[PDB]
Short mmCIF file of all heavy atoms in Angstrom, two decimals:
data_model
loop_
_atom_site.label_atom_id
_atom_site.label_comp_id
_atom_site.label_asym_id
_atom_site.label_seq_id
_atom_site.Cartn_x
_atom_site.Cartn_y
_atom_site.Cartn_z
N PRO A 105 135.89 126.40 115.72
CA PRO A 105 135.01 126.21 116.88
C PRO A 105 133.73 127.06 116.91
O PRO A 105 133.76 128.27 116.73
CB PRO A 105 135.93 126.44 118.05
CG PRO A 105 137.17 125.76 117.62
CD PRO A 105 137.28 126.19 116.11
N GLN A 106 132.58 126.40 117.16
CA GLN A 106 131.32 127.05 117.21
C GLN A 106 130.88 127.83 116.00
O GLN A 106 130.21 128.86 116.14
CB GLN A 106 131.28 127.93 118.48
CG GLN A 106 129.88 128.39 118.87
CD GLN A 106 129.85 129.10 120.20
OE1 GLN A 106 128.79 129.59 120.64
NE2 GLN A 106 130.99 129.20 120.87
N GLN A 107 131.21 127.37 114.80
CA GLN A 107 130.78 128.04 113.57
C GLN A 107 129.52 127.40 113.02
O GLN A 107 129.24 126.23 113.32
CB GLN A 107 131.84 128.05 112.51
CG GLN A 107 132.85 129.19 112.61
CD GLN A 107 133.77 129.30 111.40
OE1 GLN A 107 134.54 128.38 111.09
NE2 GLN A 107 133.66 130.43 110.71
N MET A 108 128.80 128.12 112.18
CA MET A 108 127.57 127.63 111.56
C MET A 108 127.90 126.85 110.25
O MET A 108 128.74 127.29 109.46
CB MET A 108 126.68 128.82 111.24
CG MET A 108 125.35 128.48 110.57
SD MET A 108 124.09 128.11 111.71
CE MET A 108 123.37 129.77 111.88
N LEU A 109 127.26 125.72 110.05
CA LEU A 109 127.53 124.92 108.81
C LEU A 109 126.27 124.58 108.01
O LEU A 109 125.49 123.75 108.42
CB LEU A 109 128.27 123.68 109.21
CG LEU A 109 128.55 122.60 108.16
CD1 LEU A 109 129.37 123.23 107.05
CD2 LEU A 109 129.25 121.43 108.77
N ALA A 110 126.12 125.18 106.82
CA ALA A 110 124.94 124.91 106.01
C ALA A 110 125.19 123.60 105.27
O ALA A 110 126.29 123.43 104.68
CB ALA A 110 124.74 126.04 105.03
N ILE A 111 124.18 122.70 105.29
CA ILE A 111 124.27 121.42 104.63
C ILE A 111 123.23 121.17 103.55
O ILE A 111 122.08 121.68 103.68
CB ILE A 111 124.05 120.27 105.63
CG1 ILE A 111 122.84 120.57 106.49
CG2 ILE A 111 125.29 120.06 106.44
CD1 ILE A 111 122.41 119.41 107.36
N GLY A 112 123.61 120.44 102.52
CA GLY A 112 122.71 120.06 101.45
C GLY A 112 122.19 118.70 101.69
O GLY A 112 122.53 118.06 102.68
N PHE A 113 121.46 118.14 100.79
CA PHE A 113 120.94 116.76 100.96
C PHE A 113 121.68 115.89 100.01
O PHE A 113 122.40 116.35 99.09
CB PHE A 113 119.44 116.74 100.71
CG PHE A 113 119.05 117.48 99.45
CD1 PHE A 113 118.94 116.85 98.24
CD2 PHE A 113 118.77 118.86 99.54
CE1 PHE A 113 118.61 117.58 97.08
CE2 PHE A 113 118.46 119.59 98.39
CZ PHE A 113 118.36 118.91 97.16
N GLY A 114 121.54 114.58 100.14
CA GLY A 114 122.21 113.71 99.21
C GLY A 114 123.27 112.82 99.85
O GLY A 114 123.88 113.20 100.83
N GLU A 115 123.41 111.59 99.34
CA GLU A 115 124.35 110.62 99.87
C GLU A 115 125.77 111.18 100.01
O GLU A 115 126.45 110.85 101.00
CB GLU A 115 124.39 109.37 98.97
CG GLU A 115 125.40 108.29 99.38
CD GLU A 115 124.90 106.85 99.17
OE1 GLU A 115 123.73 106.67 98.73
OE2 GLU A 115 125.67 105.92 99.51
N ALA A 116 126.20 111.99 99.05
CA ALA A 116 127.52 112.56 99.10
C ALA A 116 127.70 113.30 100.39
O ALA A 116 128.47 112.89 101.27
CB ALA A 116 127.73 113.47 97.88
N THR A 117 126.97 114.39 100.54
CA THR A 117 127.09 115.23 101.74
C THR A 117 126.58 114.51 103.00
O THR A 117 127.08 114.75 104.09
CB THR A 117 126.30 116.53 101.57
OG1 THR A 117 125.73 116.98 102.79
CG2 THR A 117 125.14 116.29 100.54
N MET A 118 125.67 113.56 102.85
CA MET A 118 125.14 112.86 104.04
C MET A 118 126.23 112.05 104.68
O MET A 118 126.42 112.11 105.93
CB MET A 118 123.98 111.98 103.60
CG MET A 118 122.70 112.31 104.34
SD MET A 118 122.62 114.09 104.87
CE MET A 118 122.48 114.91 103.21
#
Side-chain angles (χ1 to χ4, degrees):
Chain A
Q106 194 171 178
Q107 273 190 298
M108 180 87 92
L109 174 61
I111 48 172
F113 44 92
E115 176 143 0
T117 148
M118 239 29 67

